[PDB]
């Protein structure tokens, strides 16, 4: 995996921003973020609340999504809107891609396609903007889901 | 200020949806509202727009409105942190947006040869592509000048 | 009171943000909302939950920290550090402005010196920076604090 | 580089301040503050820890955490925080000044303007209430981000 920071660098970051706002729970806030560290995948709150349960059974998807807030608020994580409601979450340490999004099954597909990035400055270009950043996701059905 | 669509049509259309899912007025001006608009616009604008013939009338009710209209394929959103929820009417060409963070501009553009790639792309998944949605977050011109 | 935007459109946009979220459905995260826009002042987390337990008796000050920190993220509150931990509430929906806050007593000032917001401009100027927006507050001792 | 004070006075008043808490002298603790002491910019925990690596390789960012946290509440250092550049340090030995931030580069630009200065005294004047300290930071697009590509 490539990251654009260490974990022990977040972690410290985290439990800075804990004592700052004199936040509880730091436990599971450090679990959520190093599962997503590792993962480098796109998981949704209900696949992060199952897989930080199997070592506490406190934990409900409530708690969990004042993590993931507060996560994705101090730029720890990422979200990608899926569906309304869907929503799925990586760390925020990546280098940067776009994502193909099966509306059947849910796989995402990460890619950054060159001319898809030239292309999009140049456009702007021509209204003589400054592209500062974008959000591109592509919709589809994937092979395997075209298969069944 | 071209459409896919005559608003006849489209209402039309409208009131057939209303009696199938179960104040058919008010959804018909909200789409009209839309269709005589050249920009996009928050529930607020539309509200306000609204509020001249019918004065009192609620912001709720317009968001209910739009709801339903949204779910039901005659208006689209374009949602932003800047910019908020705004809406435009559905029957127009495709098209994606470049948005202006500093001033909230809103840029339309369709460019044949991004469609293009981007059906390329997919095809080297040998998935199949239903549909996009693409920001660009920019400052704008006027923005930049001194 | 001057407000930018209704008490109503904020509500209709917190509904929104709620479904978004996949949050609960909360009337007490509507109640904060409401007394921070009704409110002419700066509150801290223990004012408004006295405010709170008018309706629910059982409400604890952790739930209303939980509330604030989901509305200060999604912008419909501003939150200020008048101390390393000490923190005010308002409505985001104001026009700008700075504060004085009295390091003894607390109180709060608004202001906004014309003079001050164009000296601003004028030294990003010296650096040909463009001034998007600033963070200034002034610690004092209130007049009624020196007097007493 | 224009400081108020010696590396080496600094590094005394240290010694004295870790013995007065009852704590142990630490060479690591005294490379952090010469790290900053000779930085003309301001530096996060993590270009700290780089630095530092350089000599003792196996170094944790948790210590550095730990020593920042000491020498910023006992005064050795300034913190500066913002969610664009996060939290960032100083030697504590500089000039009085305030900040301007880029929100799009994150570079920080120092300034002292004695005629805001004392513009703000002049404000709480009309209040009749006595300045303490103030916090005064300004967010920009700079000029280097400002320039066209095109
Ligand atoms: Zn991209
Ligand atoms: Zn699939
Ligand atoms: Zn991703
Ligand atoms: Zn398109
Ligand atoms: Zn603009
Ligand atoms: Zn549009
Ligand atoms: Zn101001
Ligand atoms: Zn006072
Ligand atoms: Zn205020
Ligand atoms: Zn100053
Ligand atoms: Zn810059
Ligand atoms: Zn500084």
Redesign the interface.
């Known amino acids: 995996m490539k990251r654009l920071?260490?974990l022990?660098?977040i972690l410290?970051?985290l439990?800075?921003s804990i004592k700052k706002?004199?936040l509880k729970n730091s436990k599971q806030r450090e679990e959520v973020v190093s599962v997503l560290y590792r993962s480098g995948t796109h998981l949704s709150?209900e696949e992060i609340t199952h897989s930080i349960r199997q070592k506490d059974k406190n934990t409900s998807i409530?708690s969990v999504?004042?993590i993931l807030?507060?996560l994705?608020?101090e730029?720890f994580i990422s979200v990608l809107e899926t569906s309304?409601?869907g929503?799925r979450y990586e760390i925020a340490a990546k280098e940067h891609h776009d994502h193909?999004i099966?509306?059947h099954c849910g796989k995402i597909?990460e890619?950054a396609?060159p001319?898809?990035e030239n292309?999009?400055n140049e456009?702007?270009?021509k209204?003589?903007?400054?592209?500062?950043?974008?959000?591109?996701?592509?919709?589809?059905?994937?092979?395997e889901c075209?298969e069944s």
Chains 1, 3 share one sequence.
């Open positions: 920071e260490t022990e660098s410290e970051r439990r800075m706002n004199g709150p409530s999504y004042r807030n507060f994705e608020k730029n309304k409601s929503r193909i099966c509306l597909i890619f396609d001319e898809i292309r999009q456009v702007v270009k209204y003589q903007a400054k592209l500062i950043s974008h959000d591109m996701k592509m919709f589809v059905w994937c092979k075209q």
